[PDB]
Structure 1
Amino acid sequence: MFNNHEIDTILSTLRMEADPSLHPLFEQFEKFYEEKLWFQLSESLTKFFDDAKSTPLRLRLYDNFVSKFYDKINQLSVVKYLLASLKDSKDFDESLKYLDDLKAQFQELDSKKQRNNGSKDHGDGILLIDSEIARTYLLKNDLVKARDLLDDLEKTLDKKDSIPLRITNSFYSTNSQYFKFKNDFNSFYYTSLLYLSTLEPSTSITLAERQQLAYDLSISALLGDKIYNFGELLHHPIMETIVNDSNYDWLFQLLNALTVGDFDKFDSLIKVQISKIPILAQHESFLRQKICLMTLIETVFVKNIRMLSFEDISKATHLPKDNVEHLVMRAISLGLLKGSIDQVNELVTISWVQPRIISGDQITKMKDRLVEWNDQVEKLGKKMEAR
């Protein structure tokens, strides 16, 4: 419609009297193509608000505005949307060209102040620009080169670092794609979870970004066994910033399956995409032992009891003793168990390894314990006081 022209004039005029970045015919094209409230990009503060409801194409049109830009509003603002636009429009060949066009020390430092990176808010070009070259090559091309790019993103991250969330979230997003490709699903599950916690306060709070990241979280948790169980999924959202159904149904069923330990409930939850993958099934047994083990141990623990039999663990898993013998032996190897198995006693004497976290039940019990300890100590104290 006519909002491109209306906003852009009033703001251009109001600041410096000569309209400093606005020019009449650029406006004519953007009006002609669109018919919406938002325009594919705009200029200054208006550009932030106004993003495409279709595809940014007017990125080449914008570059003219970029030479003019600085006088009106600062230079640091430019990369925030324009490099992000290139990533959105899915043109590989042009995305690569512009990072070289703009580059570093040619328009990105004359006398301006450097903060680096600009996923959200804004900073200086350089550390943003590095993240974009590395992202477009990683998807496109060889794995071996995609790693070398990851290393370069890593050395730059360490050198220069900032107090906003923007840098951290950029490091996380770039690396995650690589893991997704690999059969190293366990590492992917660690990575995606870190990104989740950074993401929700600030930086990329668009629903799209939550929805893709959540889907990756669910697939990876099932493939992995890398970090605890389904407590991590409760605390952070992948089914209540977004849909509770359509491949997040699988989560609620995963919770029922782990406690119960039914193989059939594991079989039914998985649908063809997640299931085909060779990786998951082994790692299903690992998650089941860890959860079951945590439940028996809490129960017995009330002073210092940590003795649980073969019979308790065999029962829990729903596997005979011999399968369990081999299975625990694999699980201790990893160090998910730091007890020890005495074969001919038929008792497992366990030295704590459990995380013990997420409280509601545990606090009531803790409170009871804190009080008891305080009494025990108090008597000791009394005796000293006496002589």
Structure 2
Amino acid sequence: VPGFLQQSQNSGPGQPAVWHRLEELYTKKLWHQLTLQVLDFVQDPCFAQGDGLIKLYENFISEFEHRVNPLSLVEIILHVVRQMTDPNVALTFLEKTREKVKSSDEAVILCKTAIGALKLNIGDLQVTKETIEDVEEMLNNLPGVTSVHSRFYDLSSKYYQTIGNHASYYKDALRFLGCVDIKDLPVSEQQERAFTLGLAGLLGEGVFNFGELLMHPVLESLRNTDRQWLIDTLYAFNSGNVERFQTLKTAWGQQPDLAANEAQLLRKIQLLCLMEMTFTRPANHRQLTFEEIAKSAKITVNEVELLVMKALSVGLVKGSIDEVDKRVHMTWVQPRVLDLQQIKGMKDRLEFWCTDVKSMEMLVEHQAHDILT
């Protein structure tokens, strides 16, 4: 047992000192107090090349261990697989670990996520889709652990970007933010993951709510002055500004993956222009004429008809079309966010309404005094 440390004790400054402490913990037969420091043993190697040989020591203990916490065990195994890098047997290794961990709190979830990572740069049709859907064990989630939630969503965070559907990426990549992430990640990464998420926003088929992403407390705050075109464009979509979008194309950063979809992008903002145009109008008028819509979205008069139907088809506005006087009625524009001033105005409409209902109460109570009690 002690022989291994002899050849492994010459690995850096202070290395042999750590083992001597480690040996005593083994003698006492406890494992957890020996379990936490191993995590300190993964970041120790600058190259982390020889740390993969500790398997012989773990092999005896880990084979019939059933005493070390599997969550730590999957963490411990997953760290060793990092430098091992011969996947053929790692899967057997990774499958080997999976068969030995079935605790009440599923640690296989972390093991399954490790499976996909081993399949990272290979397969896109059914290589991982089979695993990820199966990985959805979260029924009986008992949320709060969330240790594996970050890993699962990250793994899913990479599938949908390798399949090209920039809609599920937003749906899941958002789930990662707000998980155990607790932000405070590498600032470069923080800005790195805001760009990727933001672009996914204005590239999807159902992502029309650019009111939460624009005010997302996490992502859109590590980008104030490094590349503001993405934040400016997000304000462009939330305001339904086609003019402010056609004059910013010249400032489109990372043109690939966003320049290819030049018509999908224009059909997204174009739809929102008819949206944050019904909102502005008071409910009384709401008589958007055909010309008044084409001008504000940069369409010809003979084409606005397909725009209104597109908005109604998705379910985002409600109304009817009258192609006799060239009018479009709107009755319900999907609610959006109001920061702090349109909410004060909402207070006014309740004061002017509570006082009106108040008056009609005493009117009946006073002229119906006999009929009461």
Same fold (TM over 0.5): yes
Extract unaligned runs of 5+ from structure 2. Answer: 1-11, 369-373
- Among 264, 288, 293, the alignment partner of 1:313 is 293
What SS does the corresponding residue of 2:127 show, helix, strand or coil? helix
* Bigger radius of gyration among the two: 2
Q: Distance in 1 between matches of 2:302 and 2:83?
A: 54
Distance in 1 between residues matched to 2:280 and 2:311, nearest whole Å: 21
**Do residues 152 (structure 1) and 134 (structure 2) align?**
yes
Correspondence for 2:178: 197
- What is the CA–CA distance in structure 2 between the aligned matches of 1:193 and 1:280, rounded to whole Å? 24
Partner of 1:284: 266
3-state SS of 2:321 partner = strand
> Paired residue for 1:220, among 200, 206, 209?
200
1:151–1:88: structure 2 CA closer, same or farther, 3 Å change rule? farther
1:246-276 CA-to-partner distances (Å, cap 9, x unmatched) read: 6x43323314544442323134314332345
* Aligned with residue 102 of structure 1, among 97, 103, 122: 97
CA distance in structure 1 between the partners assigned to 2:79 and 2:229 by the alignment: 33
Q: Distance in 1 between matches of 2:57 and 2:350?
A: 66
Which residue of the partner structure matches residue 8 of structure 2? Answer: none
CA drift at 1:87: 5.6
- Does the C-alpha gap of structure 1 residues 84 and 332 become closer, same or farther in structure 2, counting only changes over 3 Å? farther
Q: Which residue of 1 aligns with 2:326?
A: 346
Query: Aligned ranges for residues 74-113 of structure 1 at < 5 Å?
Result: 74-84=69-79, 86=81, 92-93=87-88, 95-104=90-99, 106=100, 108=101
Residues 294-305 of structure 1 correspond to what in structure 2 (within 5 A)?
Answer: 294-301=275-282
Q: How far did residue 51 of structure 1 move?
A: 4.5
**Kept after mapping to 2: 8 A contact 1:16/1:72:** no
Identity across the alignment (%) = 24
**Partner-residue secondary structure (3-state), 1:115:** coil
Within the alignment, does 1:264 sit opposite 2:247 as a pair? yes
> What is the CA–CA distance in structure 1 between the aligned matches of 2:29 and 2:211, rounded to whole Å?
57
Letter in 2 for 1:368: D
CA distance in 1, matches of 2:284, 2:201: 32
Query: Number of paired residues?
Result: 347
Match of 1:175 among 153, 156, 160: 156
Check if 1:143 corresponds to 2:125: yes
Q: TM-score, normalised by structure 2?
A: 0.77
Is the deviation greater in 351-360 or in 48-57? 48-57
Match of 1:328 in 2: 308
* 1:229 counterpart SS class: coil
Counterpart for residue 230 of structure 2: 251
> 1:55-74 alignment to 2 at 5 Å?
56-66=48-58, 67-68=60-61, 74=69
Q: CA RMSD in A?
A: 3.6
Deviation at 1:10, TM superposition (A): 4.1
* Separation in 2, partners of 1:213, 1:145: 25
Deviation string, structure 1 residues 109-160 (Cα, Å, up to 9, x no partner): 5xxx5212xxxxxxxx322212221343354125123322233223x33366
CA distance in 1, matches of 2:340, 2:292: 25
1:194 and 1:73, CA in 2 relative to 1: closer, same or farther beyond 3 A? closer
Counterpart residue number, 1:2: 13
Q: 1:114 aligns with which of 100, 104, 128?
A: 104
* Cα shift at 1:363: 1.0
- Unaligned 5+ runs, structure 1: 22-41, 117-124
Q: Which moved more, 1:254-263 or 1:361-370?
A: 254-263
Residues 380, 11 of structure 1: alpha-carbon distance in 2 compared, 3 angstrom cutoff: farther
Residues 289 and 327 in structure 2, CA contact (< 8 A), matched pair in contact too? yes
Which residue of 1 is the match for residue 9 of structure 2?
none
1:50–1:137 distance in 2 versus 1, CA, 3 Å: same
